[PDB]
From a paper:
One family of PPIases is the cyclophilins with cyclophilin A (CypA) making up approximately 0.1–0.6 % of the total cytosolic proteins. α‐Synuclein (α‐syn) is a paradigmatic IDP associated with Parkinson's disease (PD).
To gain atomic insight into the interaction of α‐syn with CypA, we crystallized the complex of CypA with the α‐synPreNAC peptide. Furthermore, the hydrophobic CypA residues F60, M61, and F113 surround the side chain of V55. Further stabilization of the complex is provided by an intermolecular contact between the side‐chain carbons of K58 and the CypA‐residue W121. The PD‐associated mutation A53E introduces a negative charge into this binding interface and sterically clashes with CypA residues. Indeed, the A53E mutation weakens the interaction of the PreNAC region with CypA and shifts the binding process from the slow to the intermediate exchange regime.
Residue numbers in the entry:
A (entry chain B): 48 to 60
B (entry chain A): 2 to 165
């Protein structure tokens, strides 16, 4: 079972 | 009492200073406990020696991948990614400590330290602590980041642990 890479997104402009 | 942990930060191996965090166990005990345990190394793995792989000035410093050391890894103390415990606490300004994730209920070990208010992350990332002492080290760290997030020097957690 393959899980996603932890991330955090910059604000949408 | 909310636990206190520390990171001793280094820059290409040169010590920069100690950052201290309060962990909000009173609101997010499961999330606090993960980070506390990973900071002490008591389970035989954790943050010591890992780096801040993504730093965007004016946004945040991201770390916590102690498994792949390339920004794609990390793991919780719970044997599986864990649930978003709650979103009671908000991203209110610099120094907030919050979990990085791959969408709902995918908490592992990666985290970020905010260097600004990041309110668009409210309800998506679990806030679980806050810089207590050494925000000026985080501000110094932040200078080795870039707009694209790659660091110009290796920012490492040279030591970490729980404080009395």
């Amino acid at each position: 079972v393959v899980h996603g890479v932890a991330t955090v997104a910059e604000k949408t402009k | 009492v909310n636990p206190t942990v520390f990171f001793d930060i280094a820059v290409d191996g040169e010590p920069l200073g100690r950052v201290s965090f309060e962990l909000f166990a009173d609101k997010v005990p499961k999330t606090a406990e993960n980070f506390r345990a990973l900071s002490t190394g008591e389970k035989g793995f954790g943050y010591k020696g890992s780096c801040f792989h993504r730093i965007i000035p004016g946004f945040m410093c991201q770390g916590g991948d102690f498994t792949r050391h390339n920004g794609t890894g990390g793991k919780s103390i719970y044997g599986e990614k864990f649930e978003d415990e709650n979103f009671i606490l908000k991203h209110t300004g610099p120094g907030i400590l919050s979990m990085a994730n791959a969408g709902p209920n995918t908490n592992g070990s990666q985290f970020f330290i905010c260097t600004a208010k990041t309110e668009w992350l409210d309800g998506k990332h679990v806030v679980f602590g806050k810089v207590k002492e050494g925000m000026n080290i985080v501000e110094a760290m932040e200078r080795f980041g870039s707009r694209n997030g790659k660091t110009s020097k290796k920012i490492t957690i040279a030591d970490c642990g729980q404080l009395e």
